[PDB]
Amino acid sequence: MGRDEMQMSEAKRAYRSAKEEGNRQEEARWANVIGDILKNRGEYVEALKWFRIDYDVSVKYLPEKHLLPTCQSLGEVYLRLEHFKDALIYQKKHLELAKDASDLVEQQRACTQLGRTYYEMFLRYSIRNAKKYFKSAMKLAQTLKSSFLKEYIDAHNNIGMLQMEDNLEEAKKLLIRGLEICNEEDDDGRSRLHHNLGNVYMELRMWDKSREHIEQDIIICKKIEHRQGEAKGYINLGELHYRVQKYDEAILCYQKALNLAQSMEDEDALASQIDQNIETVKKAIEVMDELKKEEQNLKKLTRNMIIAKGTSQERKSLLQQNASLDCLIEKSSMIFAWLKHCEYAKRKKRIASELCDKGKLSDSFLVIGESYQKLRKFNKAIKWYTKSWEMYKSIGNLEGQALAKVNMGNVLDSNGDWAGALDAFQEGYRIAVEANLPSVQLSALENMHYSHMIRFDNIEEARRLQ
C-alpha cells in the first residue's frame, strides 16, 4: 500500500485535467477510478461523492452504456453503508441496462450483486429473491463457460454460502468443489471459500477443521492486506472459540477484529457488532461462574445424600439435587455448552428414575433429547425424543407431547426429512391447540412457517404469519 499515496495524486491530476480540457468521458472515467480507490480504503461516503459525480457526468454528456458500470459501483457502496433500498435502486437499473443490451456477462454481475443485497437484507420474501438471483448468477456463469474463472468460482462461493443459511452438506460440496477448481488451475476468492468452509464446518461441529479453514482465511486476508477481510476472519475465529467455551481467546479475537474495523472510516456497523459480541462473551463469563458455583453446591448436596441414605432425608436431598440439576441445565443452555447439558440431563434422569417420578423423568427425557440434537446426534436424539413422547402419553401431559413432537420435527428437518419435519410440526400444533396452551402453539406455528418459507410456499407462510 506504499503505492496508494501517489496513485491517487495522479488520478486526481487526470480528473482535474479532463475537467480543464472538457474531456467529459475521461472526467467520468477518472471520477470512477478515484471513487474505486476511496472504496478500497473504506471511505464509502467519500466514494459515493465522486461516484455520484461520475453518474452525473455520464447522465449529462455520455451514452447510456456508461451508466452500466457506474450503477454497479454506486449500488455496491450503498450496500457497504447498509443502505439496502438505495442499493437496490441502482442494482436493478444495472440489471435492466444489462438485459436491454443482452451482453450476459454484465447480466451475471448484476444478478450476483442483486443476490448479495437480498441475502444481506434477509439476515436483518427476501430469501426467495436471494435464491432466485444467486441461482440465475450461477446459471449465467455456467453459460459464460480461463475466461470467466473468477465469476464461476465466485458464483459457486455464493451459492454454497446461501445453502447453509440449513443445507450444510450441499454447502460442503459446493465450497469444496470451488476450492478444487481453484487448485485445478493466495487469491481473494480462496479467502471467502476457506471462510464459509470453516463456517459450515464449525456448524458441523468439526472444530479443528473449521479452525484450520478460518485460520487460513485470516492468513490470506493478512497477505492481501484486506483489513475488513481479516476483521471478519477474526470475528469468526472468535465465534469458534466462543462455542467451545474458550472465552478469553474469544475476547482476544474480538478485540483484534475491533482494531481492524476501527481503522476504517465507514465500517461503523461491523465495529458495533464486534462490541456487541465482546459484551455477549463478557456476560457468558458470569454465566459460567454461576455454573461452577452451582456445581459446587451440587457436590455438597451429593455428600448430603450419601450420608442421609434410607433416612427419608434421602428423598428430600434427592429432590434438592433435582432442583440444582434444573438450574444447571438452564445455565448450561444459555451458553452453548451442550456437553455439560447432556451430563446434567442424564444425571437428572437417573435421579428421576430412582425417585419413581413419571413427570420429572419425562422432563429429563426431553432435555436429554434436546442435548442430543444440539450435538447433531440425530438418531440418538429421535430415540430420546420418542422416549419422552411415550412417557408423556402415559400420564396426563399434553404439553409434553406437543413439545416432544415439535422438537422431534426440528431434528427431522435438520436431518434432511423436510416432509416428516413439517408433519411433526403440524401434529404438535394439533396437540397444542387441543390443550389451550398458547406459547407451544406459537412455537409450532413458527417452525411450521419456517418449514414452508424454506420450501418457497408464499401463500401458506403468509397465512401462518397471521
Binding site: 479532463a18 458500470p69 458464483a155 455464493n158 464459509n196 457468558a284 413458527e446
Partner: peptide, 28 residues
C-alpha cells in the same frame, strides 16, 4: 429453528463475492 418449552448468542459473519468489474479504464 425454534426450540419449544434468555440465550447468549453472538453474531457471526459471512463473505459474499462481488461482481467482477464496475471500474472504468481511462487512457494515458
Amino acid at each position: 429453528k425454534q426450540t419449544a418449552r434468555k440465550q447468549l448468542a453472538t453474531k457471526a459473519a459471512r463473505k459474499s463475492a462481488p461482481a467482477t468489474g464496475g471500474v472504468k479504464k481511462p487512457h494515458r
